Design a protein around this ligand. Structure first.
Ligand code: CA
Length: 240
């Protein structure tokens, strides 16, 4: 997250850290959202490579013990059937991870609230992006969970030639683009939390930013629109 601020420890309890094993140690690679005690929602491009993955819930500071973390391996990976790693602009950047064990819910670990199917947000709706991603283009990961206010940019405006144009589809949600705040490498797969009916719900899965850089004027961070995948998500969890 570029242009963000440290979030109050565990103020976004459904946020998870997706890590892979590198030799004898682990490394953060993506964010994710806990949607069931044993299911995590993240981006398909986060699991393109065949490595060993693990999920950490109740995390805040990646480098030290907070006394609230729970570590669990990934037992099954279900990527959307239409995902094409060579065409992220085509969409379908969403994957579901079945955890090897069910995590314990508590003050630091809670399930994320998903929107109703088909729900589209009005322009400039209040939302927040959270993650441990780069805090600057070509920079380095944040040690502590970061958050940034990132209001939405509706499809009409986002798909105009003045922004992303044809690159963005209705199956995506755009947010930010103020040139100061944005998601960045490492935030991928993470949530876009938006206030709806007095309640924060996860409306997006961080997917991509401009090739030119993370925080670019008129190049909002693009997210997979979760509300377009409710049926698929429900069919997978009630089958696996
Ligand atoms: Ca920690």
């Amino acid at each position: 997250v570029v242009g963000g601020t440290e979030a109050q420890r565990n103020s976004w309890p459904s946020q998870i850290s997706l890590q892979y094993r590198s030799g004898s140690s682990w490394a953060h690679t993506c964010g994710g959202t806990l949607i069931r005690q044993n299911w995590v929602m993240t981006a398909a491009h986060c699991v393109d490579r065949e490595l060993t993955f693990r999920v950490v819930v109740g995390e805040h500071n990646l480098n030290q013990n907070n006394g609230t973390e729970q570590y669990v391996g990934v037992q099954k990976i279900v990527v959307h059937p239409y995902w094409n790693t060579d065409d992220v602009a085509a969409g379908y950047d969403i994957a579901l991870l079945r955890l090897a064990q069910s995590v314990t819910l508590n003050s630091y670990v809670q399930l994320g609230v998903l929107p109703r199917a088909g729900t589209i947000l009005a322009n400039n709706s209040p939302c927040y992006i959270t993650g441990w991603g780069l805090t600057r283009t070509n920079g380095q990961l944040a040690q502590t969970l970061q958050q940034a206010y990132l209001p939405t940019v509706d499809y009409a405006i986002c798909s105009s030639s003045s922004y992303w144009g044809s690159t963005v589809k209705n199956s995506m949600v755009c947010a930010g683009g103020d040139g100061v705040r944005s998601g960045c490498q490492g935030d991928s797969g993470g949530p876009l939390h938006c206030l709806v009916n007095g309640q924060y719900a996860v409306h997006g899965v961080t997917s991509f930013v401009s090739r030119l850089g993370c925080n670019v004027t008129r190049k909002p961070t693009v997210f997979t629109r979760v509300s377009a995948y409710i049926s698929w998500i429900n069919n997978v969890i009630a089958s696996n």
